[PDB]
Structure 1
Amino acid sequence: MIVKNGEKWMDRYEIDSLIGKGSFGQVVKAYDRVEQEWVAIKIIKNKKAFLNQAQIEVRLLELMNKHDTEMKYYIVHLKRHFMFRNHLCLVFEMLSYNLYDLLRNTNFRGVSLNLTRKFAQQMCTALLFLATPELSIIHCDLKPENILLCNPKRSAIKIVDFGSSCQLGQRIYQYIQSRFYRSPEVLLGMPYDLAIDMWSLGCILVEMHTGEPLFSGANEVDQMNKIVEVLGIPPAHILDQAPKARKFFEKLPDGTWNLKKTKDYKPPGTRKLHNILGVETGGPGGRRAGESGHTVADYLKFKDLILRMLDYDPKTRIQPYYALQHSFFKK
C-alpha cells in the first residue's frame, strides 16, 4: 500500500510519514483531528495470514486495556482499530525511539547500571502485569527493538509489538522469539509459558549494559552452544523431556548429557557472566572503572538477578513479582 504524506483518511487522520516497517506491514505517523494529537498507525498487509494474526494482536491489546491497574502502563496503548482499503489499522499513542537505537547511539558501549536498573524495573512490572491470571499473556518477541522510550528526554519505556503474542494455552507456533532472545525451552521444542519472556529480559538487560548481545547465535545450534558456554549443559530432567534435545546434545549410558560436537566454543559454563559484566574489573571492557553506582556490590546484585532470569528450568526461573523484590532494586 503506497501512502502519500498529506493523504487524509475518513475525515479523521492526516498521514505524515513512514516510522517503521515489518513482516506485518507498516507504521506511519498520522495526525488525529478528533483527539487533536499525533498517533502511530500500524497498517497490516491485505493478506489473510497477516490479518488473522493481527486480529489476535488487537484482541490481546483490548483485553489488557480493560484491566485498569498501576502495572498496566508499561504496555503501549492501543487507542482503537478500524478496517481501511482492506487493511486492519491499529492506532497507538506516539512513542519515541527504541532501545536498539539507544545502544547504537552509545556506539554499542552500553548504558549505565543505573539506567539498566530503571529499564529492568519497568520491564519486570510489565511482565508482572502480563502474568495477571485473566491475561496470562506471553509476549513471545521481547528484544531491544520492541521496547520504546515514552519521550526522548526521559527513561520511561513501554513494550510494543504483541504481533507474536499468545495467551497461555493458546500457542500456535513452536518456533518463536528472535533467536538471540530465544529461551532454551523454545530451542528445545518444549511447550512454553510466560517464563520465556523473563529469559528474553535477562538477555536484554545484559546487552543494554555491555552494548552487545549476550548470546548472538547465527542459527539454533550456534545459539544453544553460546548459551552452554555461559550456563553449562542444561539439567538432565529438562533434556530428558525435550523433543529437540538431540538437535544439540547426546545422552550417555549413565543418563548424563553432553554437547554434540561439530567441526572446529569455550568449554561448558566457562564463559562466566562474572567476566562478561566485569564485576571485579570496572564493568564491561573496564569502561565503568571509578564511575559512581558501579561498585563490585552493585554488580554482584545485578549478576545474581540475571542468573535467576537465565535459569534453564522455566519452573524455577525467577517470576516478575520476585524479580521486583530482588536486592538489585533496593535503595
Structure 2
Amino acid sequence: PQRVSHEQFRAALQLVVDPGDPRSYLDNFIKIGEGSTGIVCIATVRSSGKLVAVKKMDLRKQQRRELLFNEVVIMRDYQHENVVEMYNSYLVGDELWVVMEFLEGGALTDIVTHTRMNEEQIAAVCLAVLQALSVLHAQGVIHRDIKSDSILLTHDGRVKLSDFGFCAQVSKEVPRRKSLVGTPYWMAPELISRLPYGPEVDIWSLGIMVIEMVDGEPPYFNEPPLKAMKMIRDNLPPRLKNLHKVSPSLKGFLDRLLVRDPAQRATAAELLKHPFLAKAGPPASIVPLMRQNR
C-alpha cells in the first residue's frame, strides 16, 4: 500500500535525522538550484550571518524512496577534505532537509562547458575525486553518479565530491549490485548490460568526466540517452578527440579508467599512485577557471 509504505518510511527517517526544524535558526531560504531528488537553497544563520546550503527533497516524489537514506548517511560517516560537509539533517513536513556547507565555487560543469582546462588543473580535480572515492570504495560504497555535475568547488579552488543520493554498498555477503542507477552518458558498459557490478563503475564514470574536462562533452552527448546507452554497450571504449596535444601520462591514466572489462580496470587506490596525478596544481590554479574570473 501507498500509505503504509510512506508513513513507515517517514517514521524511519524521523529517527535517522536530527529532531526539530532548521527554520528555528535559519533565515532567507532562497532557491539557487534544482536537481533530480529535489531543490537546493541558500540560508543565513541568524546569529552569525554565515551562509549554508539546504537541500529539500520530497518523500512522495522519489522513484526509489529508500535512496534518501544516502542523502544523510554518506556525509555523516565519510567526513573527508574532498567530501561536502554536512551539518544537520531534518524532517520538515513531507520533505527531507539536509543542511550542508555552501560551495561558492559552483559545479565543475560550469567550468567544463565554457573554458578548456590544462592538465595541471585536470589532475587537481582527478586527485580530489579519487581521494574521496578511495575512502568510499574501501568501505564498499559505490557513488554510481560520478559526473562533472556532482563535483563542486570552493572560492579558493578546493574540490569536493557531492550528490551522494545514488550510493549503494557492497560487502562480503553482497559482492555486486544489479540496479540500473546513474546518468546514461556516464554509465559503465557492464551496468548498462545489467550485469553484477562493483565500485569499478565509478572508475569508468570518472574517465567519462576526463573526456568532459578535455573535450567539453561526454561521448554520444548529442544522441538521445536511451540510444547513447546502447552505443556505450556495444562499442569499444571511447577515445579523446585529438591525442596530439595530450601528454602520455594523461593517455596512460585514461587508459586505466576506460577499460570495458571491470576486472582489468584500475582501482581508486591504484590510480592515486599514477604519475599523472603528480602534475596536480594547487587550489590557486583552479581559481581562474571559475565564473567570477572568466
TM-score range, shorter chain: 0.7 to 0.9
Cα root mean square deviation, aligned: 2.5
Amino acid paired to 2:210: L
1:146 to 140, 143, 150: 150
User: What is the SS of the residue equivalent to 1:81?
Assistant: strand
> Corresponding residue for 1:63?
77
1:30 to 43, 60, 63: 43
Q: Which runs of 5 or more residues in structure 2 are unaligned?
A: 1-20, 280-294
Asked whether the 8 Å contact 2:84–2:161 carries over to 1, the reply is yes
Deviates more, 1:25-34 or 1:138-147: 25-34
> Corresponding residue for 2:124?
118
Q: Distance in 1 between matches of 2:95 and 2:175?
A: 25
> Corresponding residue for 2:183?
178
Q: Distance in 2 between matches of 1:91 and 1:187?
A: 33
TM-score by length of 2: 0.78
1:165 to partner: Cα distance: 0.9
Q: Deviations over 1:134-184 (max 9, x none)?
A: x32111111111101122xx4321111111111113988621110110001
**1:223 matches 2:229:** yes
Asked whether the 8 Å contact 2:175–2:198 carries over to 1, the reply is no
Q: Distance in 2 between matches of 1:48 and 1:103?
A: 31
Asked whether the 8 Å contact 1:27–1:40 carries over to 2, the reply is yes
| Residues 149 and 321 (structure 1), Cα distance of their counterparts in 2 relative to 1, 3 Å cut | same
1:125 to partner: Cα distance: 0.9
1:301 to partner: Cα distance: 1.1
**1:15 matches 2:21:** no
| Residues 86 and 172 (structure 1), Cα distance of their counterparts in 2 relative to 1, 3 Å cut | farther
Q: Distance in 1 between matches of 2:178 and 2:56?
A: 23
Asked whether the 8 Å contact 2:130–2:268 carries over to 1, the reply is yes
Amino acid paired to 1:93: E
Asked whether the 8 Å contact 1:15–1:30 carries over to 2, the reply is yes
Q: Distance in 1 between matches of 2:61 and 2:39?
A: 16
2:168 to 166, 169, 187: 166
**1:80 matches 2:88:** yes
1:99 to 94, 102, 108: 108
Q: Which runs of 5 or more residues in structure 1 are unaligned?
A: 1-7, 66-71, 232-270, 284-298
Deviates more, 1:15-24 or 1:211-220: 211-220
Asked whether the 8 Å contact 2:127–2:272 carries over to 1, the reply is yes
Higher relative contact order (CA 8 A, sep 6+): 2
Amino acid paired to 1:64: Y
1:202 to 188, 201, 207: 207
Amino acid paired to 2:217: E
The size of the alignment, in residue pairs, is: 253
Structure ranking higher in helix proportion:
2
Q: 1:123-142 alignment to 2 at 5 Å? A: 123-132=129-138, 135-142=139-146
User: What is the SS of the residue equivalent to 2:30?
Assistant: strand
> Corresponding residue for 2:243?
279
Amino acid paired to 2:27: E
| Residues 22 and 219 (structure 1), Cα distance of their counterparts in 2 relative to 1, 3 Å cut | closer
Q: 1:250-261 alignment to 2 at 5 Å? A: none
Q: Distance in 2 between matches of 1:176 and 1:124?
A: 20
Q: Distance in 2 between matches of 1:312 and 1:170?
A: 19
**1:214 matches 2:214:** no
Q: Deviations over 1:108-152 (max 9, x none)?
A: xx31121111111111111111122xx32111111111101122x
TM-score by length of 1: 0.70
Q: Distance in 2 between matches of 1:98 and 1:19?
A: 12
Asked whether the 8 Å contact 2:236–2:260 carries over to 1, the reply is no
Asked whether the 8 Å contact 1:18–1:26 carries over to 2, the reply is yes
> Corresponding residue for 1:238?
none
Q: Which has the larger radius of gyration?
A: 1
Amino acid paired to 1:183: A
Asked whether the 8 Å contact 2:113–2:217 carries over to 1, the reply is no
User: What is the SS of the residue equivalent to 1:43?
Assistant: strand
Asked whether the 8 Å contact 2:29–2:42 carries over to 1, the reply is yes
Asked whether the 8 Å contact 2:203–2:257 carries over to 1, the reply is yes
| Residues 61 and 9 (structure 1), Cα distance of their counterparts in 2 relative to 1, 3 Å cut | closer
Asked whether the 8 Å contact 2:89–2:99 carries over to 1, the reply is yes
Q: Distance in 1 between matches of 2:186 and 2:24?
A: 42
Deviates more, 1:45-54 or 1:186-195: 45-54
1:54 to partner: Cα distance: 1.4
Amino acid paired to 2:75: L
Q: Distance in 1 between matches of 2:132 and 2:87?
A: 19
Q: Distance in 1 between matches of 2:167 and 2:229?
A: 22
| Residues 78 and 172 (structure 1), Cα distance of their counterparts in 2 relative to 1, 3 Å cut | farther
